[PDB]
Design a protein around this nucleic acid. Structure first.
Ligand code: ADP
Ligand code: MG
Ligand code: ZN
Length: 693
RNA sequence: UUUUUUUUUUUUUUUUUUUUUUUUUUUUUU
RNA sequence: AAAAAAAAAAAAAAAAAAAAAAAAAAAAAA
């Protein structure tokens, strides 16, 4: 058992009244202990009064699910049965919910429950009720905006409260809200922030706020504040870094001129001129927009489109390496450019090959240099190591590739290797980011990385925003934000991540925008503190407008059915065909009648698809057309035979007759706007014949 | 030889959150 | 003409979850 603290007991007293309350406590103050104590008290009261009891615990991140469940079980002395429900587990949910008094499950499963009965063909396996659980908990409730799963659970709770489907004597469940910070959002004055906070609380049917009143000293002592030092490094326009930047701008102008001649050959006078600045995101946005127009238009010459797409891809890569050279030393940017260019080489023309070889020779002759930010970070690391031998440093970066580059830079310095200091490349488990080719993000790998950091083998953690919440990150003695800026909640979580004694938070950047964002975040935090103080001072909130306006639940569904009918009427157009072709090159991949879907995977049963595909080796699908290098999808097997799987992001839909190009981002749009493929039959036969020989 | 359960890896699709940049519209001020 | 605020569209980056499928390794049964 764990002894309750004074502020924890004060927070628990507010929720002990049975009303819906939201608890706002700093990270690491023991929200899990408070939740477990509230659950235990509610269960004891229900047992004393002689009625059924049930508790539901929900967390946005599955990484912290096991730790939270273990802590809850330990606090409850393992007297009540607990079961963890995740996507991997195939155990039925309703049976374990009925047979156990404490259920911990992903909120999406709760959303699916009591809602899957709708739009289901006739039985319907009865209907589940949200009010089955006596007490529910909403960890990290600040994300309950727009159409979040928490918003869906709130809508189900409103269904149960308003509509008269209560079975026998079912009572309204009590929900406790726990979050680090409510979230300013985009409001400016205190009144708007207070109104937004009150509306968010009303969306969860919460009227009372659990805020510490007289135990602030204990909270400050147990959770000391961490100053947020701001450090800025000036940029150097001269030296090897300046020479590298000049060479890359020369490459910018050369590629722009080549694009100009390519457009002139097409006799096209509409394309937008590139921005003068080659380092801002405006150049990348313009490149992406030009690529979108090129995909959405038709060209007289087939090779011109391929050349333009190759130029746009090289421009994007060169912008990425410009950002890398701005953030770090030119060595990593040169290495990234070299590996990307050597990967894309077998699909290039002779002139571009010579241009790249000349530019690479010039960059090799440039030399090397060191960035002031890297030197400052290294000096801070050695200073922390001198202060204590158990120093732990966590570094936040923008992208996963940025994390890998930072880890390589830190591991390449002999000054840290003299004392035996290593680093890692901690990232997130998400695989849908368009940059997952170099990212593994395995669950076991992440657990192993956490274990080695906890054991002390790894000192520097180049971790992304994933580690801010839902991760069992141990105490860190130094938090560094390497050109990374996020919202107020993420900044607060980063500041609170330094649970080690005398933790220091220092921000290192070379851009005025980062400093402005940090100042804005500090101002937002101060405004939140002022609003919280004002709310505490005045107990008469007198806020009920959103609570009464929340009666619009059924009009929402009414308009939902109306515009669903309108979308169905719009979709009624059919019996037409599509000439699906490759995005980069005008090659007939297949026709609209050769695409089939088994469950949710879209496979093309084209006998001639093998002749126009490369079939590399992992397994991947690549265009066989020269100078294309486009990944049309992934190769998968269902009947022990590999079959092609097209991707919407690598194909362009063409309509027969008029030359109207169609761009598709997700398969849902083409599914519900253009056509629907038929169900799969024993069509792997004709595909397997032509797969071999 | 087949079936059931557990673990690891991989793939497709769908539903959300946060940050930055670009563009458009409206209002206010100089 | 310039600046600020609000809404909308596009692009980039990061994070979360769900559904299904495939491969491999173990335990049990036929
Ligand atoms: N009353 C208490 N007695 C002992 N340990 C506590 C107490 N309250 C909190 N802790 C410890 O402090 C930590 C606080 O982190 P926790 O509340 O679990 O996650 P979060 O970061 O969401 O607040 C817990 O891991 C817990 O072990
Ligand atoms: Mg928590
Ligand atoms: Zn192609």
């Amino acid at each position: 058992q764990l002894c309750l603290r004074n502020y924890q007991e004060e927070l628990c007293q507010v929720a002990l009244q049975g009303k819906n309350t939201i608890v706002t406590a700093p990270t690491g103050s023991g929200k899990t202990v408070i939740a477990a104590n509230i659950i235990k008290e509610h269960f004891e009261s229900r047992s004393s009064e002689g009625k059924r009891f049930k508790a539901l615990f929900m967390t946005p991140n599955s990484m912290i699910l096991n730790q939270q469940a273990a802590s809850i079980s330990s606090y409850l002395d393992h007297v009540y049965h607990t079961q963890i429900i995740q996507g991997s587990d195939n155990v039925p949910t309703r049976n374990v919910i009925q047979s156990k008094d404490l259920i911990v499950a992903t909120p999406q499963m709760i959303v699916n429950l009591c809602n899957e009965h709708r739009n289901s063909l006739d039985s319907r396996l009865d209907q589940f009720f949200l009010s089955t659980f006596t007490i529910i908990f909403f960890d990290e409730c600040h994300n309950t905006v727009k159409n979040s799963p928490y918003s869906n659970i709130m809508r189900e709770y409103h269904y149960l409260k308003n509509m008269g489907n209560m079975p026998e004597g079912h009572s309204l469940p009590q929900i406790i809200g726990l979050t680090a910070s409510l979230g300013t959002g985009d409001k400016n004055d205190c009144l708007q922030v207070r109104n937004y906070i009150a509306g968010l609380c009303a969306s969860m049917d919460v009227k009372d706020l659990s805020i510490v009143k007289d135990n602030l000293e204990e909270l400050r002592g147990y959770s000391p504040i961490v100053p947020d030092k701001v450090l800025l490094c000036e940029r150097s326009t001269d030296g090897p870094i300046g020479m590298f930047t000049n060479r890359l701008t020369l490459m910018m102008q050369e590629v722009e001129g080549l694009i100009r001649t390519a457009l002139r050959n097409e006799h096209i006078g509409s394309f937008l001129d590139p921005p003068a600045d080659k380092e801002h995101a405006g150049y990348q946005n313009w490149v992406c927009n030009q690529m979108n127009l090129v995909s959405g238009t038709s060209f007289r010459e087939t090779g011109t489109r391929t050349i333009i797409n190759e130029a746009l891809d090289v421009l994007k890569e060169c912008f990425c390496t410009l950002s890398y050279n701005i953030n770090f030393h030119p060595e990593v940017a040169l290495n990234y450019l070299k590996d990307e260019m050597e990967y894309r080489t077998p699909n290039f023309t002779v002139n571009m090959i010579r241009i790249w070889e000349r530019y690479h020779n010039q960059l090799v002759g440039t030399g090397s240099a060191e960035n002031p930010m890297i030197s400052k970070t290294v000096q801070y690391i050695v200073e922390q190591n001198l202060q204590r031998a158990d120093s732990r440093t966590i570094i936040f970066v923008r992208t996963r590739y940025e994390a890998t580059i930072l880890n390589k830079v830190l591991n390449s310095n002999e000054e840290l290797l003299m004392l035996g200091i290593k680093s890692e490349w901690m990232s997130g488990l998400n695989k849908s980011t368009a940059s997952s080719a170099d990212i593994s993000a395995s669950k076991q790998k992440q657990m192993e990385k956490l274990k080695m950091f906890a054991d002390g083998e790894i000192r520097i953690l180049v971790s992304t925003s994933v580690a801010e919440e839902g991760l069992d990150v141990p105490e860190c003695s130094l938090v560094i934000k390497y050109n990374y800026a996020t919202n107020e909640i993420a900044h607060v979580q980063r500041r609170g991540r330094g649970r080690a004694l005398n933790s220091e938070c220092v921000l290192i950047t070379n851009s005025i925008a980062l400093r402005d964002q940090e100042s804005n975040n500090r101002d937002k935090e101060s405004l939140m503190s002022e609003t919280i103080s004002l709310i505490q001072n005045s107990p008469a909130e007198f806020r009920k407008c959103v609570d009464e306006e929340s009666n619009k639940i059924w009009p929402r569904i009414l308009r939902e059915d109306t515009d669903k009918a309108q979308k169905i009427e719009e979709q009624i157009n059919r019996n037409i065909v599509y000439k699906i072709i490759c995005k980069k090159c005008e090659a007939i991949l297949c026709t609209s009648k050769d695409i089939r879907s088994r469950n949710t995977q879209y496979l093309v049963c084209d006998p001639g698809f093998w002749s126009l595909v490369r079939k590399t080796r992992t397994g991947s699908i690549n265009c066989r057309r020269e100078n294309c290098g486009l990944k049309l999808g992934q190769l998968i097997e269902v009947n022990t035979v590999d079959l092609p799987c097209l991707s919407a992001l690598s194909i362009v839909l063409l309509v027969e007759g008029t030359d109207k190009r169609i761009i598709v981002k997700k398969w849902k749009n083409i599914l519900d706007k253009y056509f629907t493929p038929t169900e799969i039959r024993q069509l792997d036969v004709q595909t397997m014949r032509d797969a071999d020989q």
